[PDB]
Amino acid sequence: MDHLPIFCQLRDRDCLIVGGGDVAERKARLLLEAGARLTVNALTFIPQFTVWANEGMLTLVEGPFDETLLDSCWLAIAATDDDTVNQRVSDAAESRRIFCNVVDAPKAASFIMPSIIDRSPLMVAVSAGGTSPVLARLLREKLESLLPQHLGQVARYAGQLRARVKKQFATMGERRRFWEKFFVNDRLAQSLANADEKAVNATTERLFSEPLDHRGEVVLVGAGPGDAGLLTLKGLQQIQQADIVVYDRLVSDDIMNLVRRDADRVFVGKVPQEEINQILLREAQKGKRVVRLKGGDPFIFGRGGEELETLCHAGIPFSVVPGITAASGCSAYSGIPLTHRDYAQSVRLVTGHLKTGGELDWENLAAEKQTLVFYMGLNQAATIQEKLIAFGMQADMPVALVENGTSVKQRVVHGVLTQLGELAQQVESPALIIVGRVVALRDKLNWFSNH
Amino acid sequence: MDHLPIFCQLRDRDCLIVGGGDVAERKARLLLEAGARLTVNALTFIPQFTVWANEGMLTLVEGPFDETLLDSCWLAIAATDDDTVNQRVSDAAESRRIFCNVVDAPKAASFIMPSIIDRSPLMVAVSAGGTSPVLARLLREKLESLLPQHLGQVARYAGQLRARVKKQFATMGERRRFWEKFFVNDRLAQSLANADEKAVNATTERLFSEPLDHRGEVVLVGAGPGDAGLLTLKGLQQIQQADIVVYDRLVSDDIMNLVRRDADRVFVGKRCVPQEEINQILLREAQKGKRVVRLKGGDPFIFGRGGEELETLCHAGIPFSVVPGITAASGCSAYSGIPLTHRDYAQSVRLVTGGGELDWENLAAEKQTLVFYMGLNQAATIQEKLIAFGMQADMPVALVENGTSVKQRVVHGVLTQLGELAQQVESPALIIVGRVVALRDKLNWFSNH
Ligand SMILES: C[C@@]1(CC(=O)O)C2=NC(=C\c3[nH]c(c(CCC(=O)O)c3CC(=O)O)Cc3[nH]c(c(CC(=O)O)c3CCC(=O)O)/C=C3\N/C(=C\2)[C@@H](CCC(=O)O)[C@]3(C)CC(=O)O)/[C@H]1CCC(=O)O
Ligand SMILES: NC(=O)c1ccc[n+]([C@@H]2O[C@H](COP(=O)([O-])OP(=O)(O)OC[C@H]3O[C@@H](n4cnc5c(N)ncnc54)[C@H](O)[C@@H]3O)[C@@H](O)[C@H]2O)c1
Ligand SMILES: Nc1ncnc2c1ncn2[C@@H]1O[C@H](CSCC[C@H](N)C(=O)O)[C@@H](O)[C@H]1O
Ligand SMILES: Nc1ncnc2c1ncn2[C@@H]1O[C@H](CSCC[C@H](N)C(=O)O)[C@@H](O)[C@H]1O
Ligand SMILES: [Cl-]
Ligand SMILES: [Cl-]
Ligand SMILES: [Cl-]
Ligand SMILES: [Cl-]
Ligand SMILES: [Cl-]
Ligand SMILES: [Cl-]
Ligand SMILES: [Cl-]
Q1: Are the beta carbons of A135 and B142 separated by less than 8 Å?
Q2: Ligand closest in space to the Cα of A438
Q3: What number of other Cβ atoms are within 10 A of residue B106's Cβ?
Q4: A135 and B179: CB-CB below 8 Å?
Q5: Taking the domain A214-325, which CATH number applies?
Q6: What 3-state class would DSSP assign to A265?
Q7: CATH architecture of B328-449
Q8: From 3.40.50.720, 3.20.20.70, 3.90.180.10, 1.10.260.40, which CATH number describes the B1-112 domain?
């Protein structure tokens, strides 16, 4: 990331502002409200500084920059109109390791000031890093509409209850169930805003009085095929709120960046399958919220059935969030719809990785008016070619292979059936094989990239 | 206000973490993402730390906390399970005026780590000062859903391409409407993200050429089968920047509630709008220079005629894109406890529609999960002809009606009972044929209605 956002306690801590005009003023107001012990060192001062100095709210130092003023300081702000003076202030601060903002110069400061949406004690800060000040302000206002004014009264009450919530709940997993109920009780929010105390207490005592469900849970979540925009709303919720995320390798890194930062991640795979099952079951028995995060959809060649059947009579609550399967993701992003008027009456989602002694039913697969989609079929493209031709599929039937579909790394090779073996040599997994006349639609429908 | 948020530039600045467990490891990773010159001092380290040390990415000091490690430090984090150590650390940090966090003790610290939505260089931070971390996390989740993944790319390209400064826009009012066009153009954004810079300046100079009021594009968004939580993030983002939403009735009311409050709505469904009318409504509304979202149940390219709808816009020079959706097969499969595949049960899932006939001999072959879209009418012919063409009569069947919705109904039995099990359900309904259906009584986690 460009920056690390932090929230500083500035109460009773020395801060220095060099500069005395309109920019200096605005930053000083900020620092005063955070409780900084503030000195302002400037050649000249606009009247607001006189106001503040006369009522004992800051110290004014009238004259050129005095770097010894930095000596006791946690933060410094260079707000003069003189680039030279500002750079001297910046240098002096770096030597002392004091975080420094240079108002005219986002790239040269050691911190920048964010735009602040204030719902104290709840605060939202947004910044483009100085690159895009207009985007920040349009975000700033969109955030404003989204955050109810009274959210502060809810967050304020939460802090007052924290001691009581720590005493009455011994676990920290039971404390989460209480807060999750607390923060979405609309009547409680309302009664706080109306300062209706008897209503606040009535709802509050009921909340405390509620037997919490101690059982854990397992949720199979489909990550989709890679593009993180293709995660579902509910999938996002589960991974934002999970205690532990068990995940395989076809889950994308961008999707992993959406996991609760505070949650335990457990990788499986490139681990046997019955291994995975018990990892979940004992972990859900242990009372924690477990997400099995799976590539694409969990019930299309994900073995999600296997992972769940372990839990049915083991009394473990479970649930399933479907995901965008590879055929759907690769259909959309290659410009190759899986159906179209009648090019196809069927879509066949077919595995290539078959049993110890399993053979696909080629005679059936070669039938006309369908879109074939092979999962896990890279290493048998030549066999797929040879069999489909032998059971009637025309030689010039168009095919496509989508490698890393929906990713910024997505590659699409295509051609006709007698090239399928050759084409497959030009991709690595994960790749999907699409066979059918809809592959020709690519050139009119392909919207996402030429790779 | 009780804490001042600032955005620290940490690239190659010395920071210290004290502790070497899971907690310290999470903080180390965040500080690494920010490019800190990271030292980690702990009595023992979990493996992740020594991996990080072997790839040159940080420095480890094995042993008790030594406060001279703070000597050239900009930021300090106390992440041990030992309050005595954490106090020693934060105290050592305060006398040096090094901003310090005690992970576990928000007011021991001199700073708090907020929740972070990272769209670098664009960033959002959420904190309540230690009073409401769950609330902070709830707000992170929603901001993650609302902020596109590659807004950052656009952020970068923006500050740079203002070389066309006032160029053609002298009014702050004119400019901020160009920036409005600019930051929500998600095609520019993915073309940036994909590095396709022929598609960049394509989309770029259209933005600088076309009239400033004009925003003409079409997005096919799949709404999934009805549960509003099955919209994708990008689905949501798109239906929130729409000028005009064209929706079709297989779009649930819950999904429509998420639609932009100020978007226009055109209901193209039944009460029977033929396809061509739809195909030019989209065309027309996009010709007017409006950001058009066409909402469709499930996934647009699976029996949705999505391709037909894009054939219109293709040669009209109107940009389009597609956001796939959860198709009814997946949604019904997940919410009914019937996986489309399981072990050796099925080598292939068949999504099939209810001029021409269906190849019953092929539908009848073994080791398939058959999924019948729009087949409630034909449910009796289906039953008849599947048995006639050799499918074993005991084959489990299930019909899922309004799958994923708060009124979904699952009625199941055996191929003999297919036609009559259909009278119990109304459109929209899926017919599932195959041995996977039997797992329902072991995997039914939704509530049947
Ligand atoms: C942002 C993030 C750091 C990061 O970015 O990595 C950080 N912790 C994360 C989330 C989170 N951590 C925990 C919970 C469950 C809490 C619950 O149930 O109440 C959650 C919420 C959740 O996600 O469920 C365990 C925990 N944490 C704290 C306590 C209480 C205490 O210590 O007093 C307890 C439980 C002890 C108990 O159960 O008793 C303290 C804090 N948690 C805050 C945020 C800070 C002030 C919050 C504010 O003032 O509003 C602060 C002081 C940490 C700091 O400043 O370092 C990261 C968000 C990642 C994301 O958003 O994805
Ligand atoms: N690119 C843009 O379009 C853009 C973006 C942001 C801001 N701006 C403008 O730039 C303006 C800057 O002007 P200002 O508001 O600061 O008014 P100002 O002229 O009063 O600020 C100068 C201040 O710097 C101090 N100063 C100068 N030399 C000094 C020295 N050697 N030691 C100590 N202090 C010294 C003085 O106290 C003086 O008050 C802002 O008002 C803002 O509107 C323009
Ligand atoms: N992004 C992607 N692009 C192309 N193929 C992918 C893919 N992600 C997964 N696949 C395919 O999925 C196979 C794994 S089987 C798991 C598939 C997943 N459950 C789904 O519903 O899509 C891989 O062999 C590969 O063929
Ligand atoms: N919520 C739902 N529950 C069960 N079946 C549904 C459904 N929504 C759509 N369908 C099925 O889809 C048919 C309409 S055709 C449109 C399908 C859509 N493109 C998709 O991906 O799902 C209906 O006849 C019904 O069989
Ligand atoms: Cl900015
Ligand atoms: Cl936005
Ligand atoms: Cl499977
Ligand atoms: Cl078709
Ligand atoms: Cl179709
Ligand atoms: Cl079978
Ligand atoms: Cl029907």
Answers
A1: no
A2: 8
A3: 22
A4: yes
A5: 3.40.1010.10
A6: strand
A7: 2-Layer Sandwich (3.30)
A8: 3.40.50.720
